[PDB]
């Protein structure tokens, strides 16, 4: 069925109308593309998958938007290859729950499981295991491009078709949909984590942690810091470390099932605040709960700790999602941004920081080595003209956004933040030179 619809991504802004394509049948999809093909120049197409980027890259107003959450089918799983062959518009949790039986895990893992495989793919997302295991791109051994020609072409990361591959890796849908795809999966004898958890007191402390070769040791890693308080509480940090756990290592209680996978405001409606929680022995009960060794805790617990806060309203609409990586040896820079985000008089509470590793060969992939930040600032007066500020500061420090969170920087700021774009839109042009895949996003930030 094609349907003219209102969509956003997941910050409920920048709305557009498109005619959205939402279709099982992969023929079906194949014609669509050939029809927008044989127009011969109009607004394009765009593949979707469960919108979950904030911005506006999964839109394409007045044009062609292809849903692909129907294309859905798990082909099979193999625990010998390690190796899974689904459709594009399969997600993580869906993957994650079919492939534990396997001892399989899936390699990269974002802060939600509700996104594709091709969504995954196309924004080469990353985890809170970057440092260990890269992107999610570096997991893909191969997929099937619908290309603009009409075409359906077996990408390889090695293979005759690398550059495409590479180009498609973090291309925003830019060189065509994505139908299906081979991913080599970690293996696990669980589904569970051993974690060890840090409380720092201030941004240099959080810093130093990171710095004193400690990473190594973990596999997974990643942080919530404060950027409301005045130094020096200031970048003062709840740190989680871990890895998988093996069987051995869980307790009698749960070695029987030991790859199974299995709220707050419910049981404290008051708020968890009480005269104790801002002073000495409030810093004394956090210092000690956020601190531990050897904790075994299932996905939940290690990996989606938002989860319990409930209806603590916070991320939907009225907010501005932020997130920045600055390169690791620009440490004076980097906390100089967290000094003029604390300063500004725009507040967020719910921060991410995370040293991310080396960067894989995606021209236009987001992750390179550096201190990731996320920030969530309230939509209020002031804050375009500062976070454009932000963006300058980004650049000159040789950072860069993510276009799976931007709905508003300009394409020449994202120009100079991507270095290889040229190399990048010059693949693009080879393999769509009709702009056949086209979103609101390539136009914003000319990529089209
Ligand atoms: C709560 C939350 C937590 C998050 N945490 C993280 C995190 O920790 N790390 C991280 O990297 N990201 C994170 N994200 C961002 C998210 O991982 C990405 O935006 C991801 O791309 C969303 O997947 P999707 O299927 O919803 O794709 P959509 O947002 O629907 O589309 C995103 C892009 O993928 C393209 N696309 C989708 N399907 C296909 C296809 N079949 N072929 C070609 N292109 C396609 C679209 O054209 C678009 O350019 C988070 C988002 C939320 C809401
Ligand atoms: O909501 C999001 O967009 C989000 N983005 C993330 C980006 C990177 C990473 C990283 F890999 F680095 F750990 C994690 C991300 N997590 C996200 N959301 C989940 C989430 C956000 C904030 C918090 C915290 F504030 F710390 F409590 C806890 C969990
Ligand atoms: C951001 C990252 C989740 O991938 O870490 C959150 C952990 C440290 O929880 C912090 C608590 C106090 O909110």
């Known amino acids: 069925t094609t349907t003219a619809t209102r969509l956003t991504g997941w910050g409920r802004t920048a709305p557009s109308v498109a005619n959205v394509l939402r279709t099982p049948d992969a023929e079906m999809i194949v014609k669509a593309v050939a029809r927008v093909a044989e127009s011969g120049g109009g607004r394009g197409a765009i593949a979707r998958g469960l919108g979950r980027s904030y911005g506006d890259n999964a839109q394409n107003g007045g044009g062609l938007v292809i849903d692909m959450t129907p294309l859905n089918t798990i082909h099979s799983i193999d625990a010998d290859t390690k190796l899974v062959d689904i459709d594009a518009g399969v997600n993580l949790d869906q993957l994650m729950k079919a492939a534990l039986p396997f001892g399989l895990w899936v390699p990269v893992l974002p802060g939600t499981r509700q996104v594709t495989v091709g969504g995954a793919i196309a924004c080469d997302i990353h985890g809170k295991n970057h440092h260990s295991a890269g992107s999610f791109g570096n997991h893909v051994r191969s997929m099937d491009l619908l290309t603009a020609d009409g075409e359906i072409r077996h990408l390889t990361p090695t293979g005759e078709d690398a550059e495409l591959f590479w180009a498609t890796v973090g291309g925003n849908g830019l060189t065509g949909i994505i139908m299906r795809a081979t991913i080599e999966m970690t293996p696990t004898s669980t589904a569970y984590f051993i974690a060890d958890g840090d409380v720092t007191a201030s941004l240099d402390e959080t810093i130093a942690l990171h710095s004193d070769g400690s990473e190594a040791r973990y596999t997974y ?228």
């Open 221 to 448: 890693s990643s942080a919530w810091f404060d950027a409301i308080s005045a130094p020096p509480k200031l970048g003062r940090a709840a740190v989680s470390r871990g890895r998988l756990a093996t069987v051995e290592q869980l307790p009698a209680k749960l070695r029987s099932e030991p790859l199974k996978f299995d709220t707050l405001p419910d049981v404290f409606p008051n708020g968890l605040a009480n005269k104790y929680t801002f002073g000495p022995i409030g810093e004394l009960w956090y210092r000690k709960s956020g601190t531990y060794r050897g904790k075994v805790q299932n996905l939940t617990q290690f990996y989606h700790p938002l989860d319990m806060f409930g209806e603590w309203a916070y991320g939907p609409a009225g907010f501005l999602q932020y997130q920045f990586v600055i390169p690791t040896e620009a440490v004076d820079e980097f906390k100089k941004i967290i000094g003029v985000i604390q300063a500004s008089g725009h507040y967020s509470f719910l921060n991410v920081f995370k040293l991310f590793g080396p960067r894989n060969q995606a021209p236009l992939s987001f992750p390179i080595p550096g201190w990731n930040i996320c920030v969530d600032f309230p939509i209020k007066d002031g804050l375009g003209k500062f976070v454009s500020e932000l963006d300058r500061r980004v650049l000159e420090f040789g950072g860069r956004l993510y276009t799976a969170k931007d709905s508003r920087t300009t394409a020449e700021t994202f120009h100079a933040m991507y270095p290889r774009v040229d190399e990048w839109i010059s693949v693009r042009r080879k393999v769509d030179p009709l702009r056949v895949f086209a979103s609101d996003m390539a136009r914003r930030l000319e990529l089209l």
